[PDB]
Amino acid sequence: MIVGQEKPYQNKNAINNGVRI
Amino acid sequence: MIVGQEKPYQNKNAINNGVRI
Amino acid sequence: MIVGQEKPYQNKNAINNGVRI
Amino acid sequence: MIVGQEKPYQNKNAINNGVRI
Amino acid sequence: MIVGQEKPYQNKNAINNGVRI
Amino acid sequence: MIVGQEKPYQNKNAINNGVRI
Amino acid sequence: MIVGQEKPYQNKNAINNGVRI
Amino acid sequence: MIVGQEKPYQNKNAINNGVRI
Amino acid sequence: MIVGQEKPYQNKNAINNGVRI
Amino acid sequence: MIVGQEKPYQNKNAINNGVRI
């Protein structure tokens, strides 16, 4: 039973490489 | 039973490479 | 039973490479 | 039973490489 | 039963490599 | 002159949410 | 002259949320 | 002249939230 | 001249939240 | 001239929150 995630709730995964204003 | 995710709820996965204003 | 996701609800997956204003 | 995460709630994972203003 | 995390709640994991203003 | 990216070369942007074997 | 990235070369940006074997 | 990154070369930005084997 | 990074070379930025084997 | 980093070379920035074997 190999499983990644169970009920991830609003996990904000961001990889910001540019510009945010 | 190999499974990635169970009920991911509003997980904001963003890879920002440009410009956001 | 190899399965990717079960009931993903409004997961906003965005790969922004350009400009958003 | 190899599993990554159980109910991660609003975990803000950010890799900021550019500019945020 | 090898598992990474159980109910991580709002863990702000940030790798800041650029500029934040 | 607001521009997102100039000559992005083979940038592999992947958002893996399921199973890859 | 607001710009995100200049010549990003093979930047592997991955947000792994499931299972990779 | 607000700019995020100049010639990022093979920067491996990974946000691993699940299982990798 | 506000800029995040200049020629980042193979910077391995990882946020491991699950299981790696 | 506000700038984050100049030629970061193979800086391994890791935030390990789970299990690594």
UniProtKB/Swiss-Prot annotation, chains A, B, C, D, E, F, G, H, I, J:
Which organs or tissues contain this protein? Highly expressed in adult and fetal liver and weakly in testis. Not expressed in bone marrow.
Expression is induced as follows: By phytohemagglutinin (PHA).
In which compartments does the protein localize? Cytoplasm; Secreted
Q: What does this protein do?
A: Has a neutrophil chemotactic activity. Also a positive regulator of chondrocyte proliferation. Does not show metalloendopeptidase activity.
Subunit-structure text: Interacts with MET.
Family of the protein in this entry: Belongs to the LECT2/MIM-1 family.
The identity of this protein, by name, is Leukocyte cell-derived chemotaxin-2
Q: What is the lineage of its organism?
A: Eukaryota, Metazoa, Chordata, Craniata, Vertebrata
Q: From which residue to which, out of the full length, is covered?
A: 73 to 93 of 151
